[PDB]
C-alpha cells in the first residue's frame, strides 16, 4: 500500500495472507466463510511469468497483523483443500475475471481477529458502487515501489469509467472498476506489489456491515499521477461464486 497507515488491531478481520511454503508472501486474500477464501486468479496462475501454484504449494494465514512474526495464539494457518479459478479468467490479455476461490482443509474458528466479510447483493452494489464513494484497501505489499512491519490500510475513491479507460492502453471490461485520487485531488494512495488478491471493502450505511466490492487486481506502477488501481468487480462475478460454493462446498 502506498501512502496508507498502520491498521488498527482487529480492523480487517477478514484479511488473509497467501503464504508460500521459499516461505514468502504471495498476495492478500479475504475470508468469506469459515471454509472459503477469495483472491485474485493471477496470484495463483500467470503463465507469462511461469506462475502456476497448486494446493500443496501454499498456506493461508488468518488473524495476522504483523507481516513476518508468527503471531502465537492469534493467527491461524490453514492448508488448502482445493483451488478454483474462474474458467474465463483472461491471463492472455487484461486479467479479465481475475478471481479464484480457495476451499480450506478445515473450517477456521472465528475470534476477535478472524471474522468473514459479506459479499454484496445487487442492491448493496447498486447504491455503493458509485464514482466518488470511498472504499478501503488493505495489505502488506510494497510501500513504495518499496515493506511495512504491520498491515497497512488506505481509503480510496471510486473513479468514473471513462476516466479509468482513458488512463491506460489496456482494454477495460465490465468486470473491473478502478479507484484512486485524481492528480488534482492532492491526496494520494494506491495498492502496490504484494497487495494483490486483497479486499476492496465498503461499509454499508444501511446496515453498518462491511462489504467486499473489489479484489486488488492490476495497475501500472504504484501511486502514479494520472493512473489508477484496477480491481475485480465482485458483484458481477457473484453468480460464479455461489455456483462453486453450492456445487461443491
Amino acid at each position: 500500500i502506498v501512502e496508507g497507515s498502520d491498521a488498527e488491531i482487529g480492523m480487517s478481520p477478514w484479511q488473509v495472507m497467501l503464504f508460500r511454503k521459499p516461505q514468502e508472501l504471495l498476495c492478500g486474500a479475504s475470508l468469506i466463510s469459515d471454509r472459503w477464501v477469495l483472491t485474485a486468479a493471477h496470484c495463483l496462475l500467470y503463465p507469462p511469468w511461469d506462475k502456476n501454484f497448486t494446493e500443496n504449494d501454499l498456506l493461508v494465514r488468518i488473524g495476522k497483523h504483523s507481516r513476518t512474526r508468527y503471531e502465537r495464539n492469534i493467527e491461524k494457518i490453514s492448508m488448502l483443500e482445493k483451488i478454483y479459478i474462474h474458467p474465463r479468467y483472461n491471463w492472455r490479455e487484461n486479467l479479465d475475471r481475475d478471481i479464484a476461490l480457495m476451499k480450506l482443509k478445515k473450517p477456521v474458528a472465528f475470534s476477535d481477529y478472524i471474522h468473514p466479510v459479506c459479499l454484496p447483493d445487487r442492491e448493496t452494489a447498486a447504491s455503493l458502487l458509485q464514482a466518488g464513494y470511498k472504499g478501503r484497501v488493505t495489505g502488506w505489499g510494497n510501500l513504495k515501489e518499496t515493506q511495512p512491519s504491520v498491515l497497512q490500510v488506505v481509503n480510496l475513491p471510486i473513479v468514473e469509467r471513462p476516466v479509468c479507460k482513458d488512463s491506460t492502453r489496456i482494454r477495460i471490461t465490465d468486470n473491473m472498476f478502478c479507484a484512486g485520487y485524481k492528480p488534482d485531488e492532492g491526496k494520494r494512495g494506491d495498492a502496490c506489489e504484494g497487495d494483490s488478491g486483497g479486499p476492496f471493502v465498503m461499509k454499508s450505511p444501511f446496515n453498518n456491515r462491511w462489504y467486499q466490492m473489489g479484489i486488488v487486481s492490476w495497475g501500472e506502477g504504484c501511486d502514479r499521477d494520472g493512473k489508477y488501481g484496477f480491481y475485480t468487480h465482485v458483484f458481477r462475478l457473484k453468480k460464479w461464486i455461489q455456483k462453486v460454493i453450492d456445487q461443491f462446498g
Binding site: Q23, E24, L25, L59, T68, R69, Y70, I77, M79
Partner: peptide
C-alpha cells in the same frame, strides 16, 4: 519471515 510451526 519468522519461521512457522513445523506441524503446518
Amino acid at each position: 519471515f519468522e519461521e512457522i510451526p513445523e506441524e503446518y
